[PDB]
């Protein structure tokens, strides 16, 4: 795979600035945090539930194990 033989592209214009003309951390916080919150809210419903389940099974199972070895659960 080599530049020049990848694929066909027509009518696209790309504008760029030298890295020396710009900031490396533009709006790092004033925008970074808000986007992180967006991305977090955006996935938490897909990611978190299964782990909350793990957490529950773990605490229940661990406590169940403890109680089971005692005289008076």
């Amino acid at each position: 795979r080599q530049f020049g033989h990848l694929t066909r592209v027509r009518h696209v214009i790309t504008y760029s600035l030298s890295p020396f003309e710009q900031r490396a951390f533009p709006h790092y916080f004033s925008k970074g945090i808000p986007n992180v919150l967006r991305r977090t809210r955006a996935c938490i419903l897909r990611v978190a539930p299964p782990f909350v389940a793990f957490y529950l099974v773990y605490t229940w199972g661990t406590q169940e194990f403890e109680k089971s070895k005692r005289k008076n659960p």
């Binding site: 027509r10 009518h11 696209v12 214009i13 790309t14 504008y15 760029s16 600035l17 030298s18 890295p19 710009q22 900031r23 490396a24 951390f25 533009p26 070895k69």
Partner: protein, 241 residues
């Protein structure tokens, strides 16, 4: 029983990430091992030379080694013989083999202590709790001859009788030899014995942290610098119409 009692966390002076061992405590701990534990426990991987620059001067360690007699040879006649110990010798073994060790301890085998702190969950917290934790069996518990009740030992029945108590030995610096003091010191010595690299890894750790604190932000700045070309680029689609 199958019940378990886990040791609490003692605030060892070497607990902290950048906290070294207390070498005076290592020195006292060695005295405990020498006078008390060595009669039953071996420490096969430690030699008198290892003590030099850690808790004793070279002259002191040489003197400690000369206190014992070790086998050497064969000589010109093909005979083995005894000589004063020296820095290169490893601590004497109390028994020639584990069979003899068990025979001298009602069937129980005192394990080698070189790595005991690393070979047990809880490390020195476990050893300290064990050493200072002997008590009378709870009502209903009857131990076979030769076994002692210790809540910290798995199963609670151990073949080692309480090895320490007040004044079991006299320290070279006058420190009151109470049971807890003796345990605290021998546990510290055992930490050094199992991990002699302890102090050095932490010193290196500090330098590693200082170096990463420098390099990571810099390389990250290099990353952001290069990527800024892509991060701020704009696109336009101008198809002929």
């Amino acid at each position: 029983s199958d019940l378990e009692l886990h040791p609490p966390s003692y605030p060892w002076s070497h607990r902290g990430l950048l906290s070294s061992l207390d070498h005076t405590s290592i020195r006292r701990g060695f005295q405990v091992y020498k006078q008390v534990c060595s009669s039953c426990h071996s420490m096969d991987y430690v030699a008198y030379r290892h003590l030099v620059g850690v808790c004793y001067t070279e002259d002191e360690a040489k003197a400690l080694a000369e206190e014992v007699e070790v086998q050497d040879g064969p000589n010109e006649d093909g005979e083995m013989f005894m000589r004063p110990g020296k820095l290169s010798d490893y601590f004497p073994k109390p028994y020639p083999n584990p069979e003899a060790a068990r025979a001298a301890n009602n069937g129980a085998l005192p394990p080698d202590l070189s790595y005991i702190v690393r070979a047990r969950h809880g490390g020195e917290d476990y050893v300290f709790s064990l050493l200072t934790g002997y008590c009378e069996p709870p009502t209903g518990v009857s131990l076979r001859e030769g076994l002692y009740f210790n809540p910290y030992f798995p199963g609670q029945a151990i073949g080692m009788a309480p090895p320490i108590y007040n004044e079991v030995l006299e320290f070279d610096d006058g420190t009151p030899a109470t049971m807890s003091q003796v345990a605290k010191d021998v546990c510290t010595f055992l930490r050094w014995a199992a991990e002699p690299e302890h102090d050095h890894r932490k010193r290196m750790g500090l330098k590693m942290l200082l170096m990463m604190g420098l390099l990571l932000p810099l390389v990250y700045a290099m990353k952001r610098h290069k990527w800024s070309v892509l991060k701020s680029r704009k696109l336009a689609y101008r198809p002929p119409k």
